[PDB]
Design the sequence.
């Protein structure tokens, strides 16, 4: 729900190049994608440990 | 004139052998079932990790 709106804001604001918001857009991208990789990996490890309990 | 006690001792001694080896074999086959399911979980996790990297 957060990623699908930040990426839509990225597609909206940079149809043409915006040099004033260019240094912050990269930080927002790095922050949200590094958050997502950690969350998805921990969700997979949790489901695996749950499957190994039967 | 009718040896019923030796008959009962023989029946119970032939029937205890079978109880002993059923109780011994069932635990070991259940342990092998647990080990095979654990090995299939480890196999899934390793090949899924390599798939996601590729």
Sequence:
């Amino acid at each position: 729900g957060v990623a699908t709106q930040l990426l839509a804001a990225y597609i909206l604001l940079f149809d043409e190049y915006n040099e004033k918001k260019a240094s912050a857009q990269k930080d927002i991208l790095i922050k949200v994608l590094d958050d997502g990789i950690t969350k998805l990996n921990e969700a997979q490890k949790s489901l695996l440990v749950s499957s190994q309990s039967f | 004139v009718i040896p019923w006690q030796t008959f009962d001792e023989t029946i119970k001694e032939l029937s205890r052998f079978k109880q002993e080896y059923s109780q011994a074999a069932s635990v070991l086959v259940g342990d092998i079932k647990t080990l095979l399911m654990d090995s299939q979980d480890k196999y899934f996790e390793a090949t899924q990790t390599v798939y996601e990297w590729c």
Observations:
- Residues 11 and 17 of chain A are 11 Å apart (CA to CA).
- The helical segments of chain A are 3-13, 22-51.
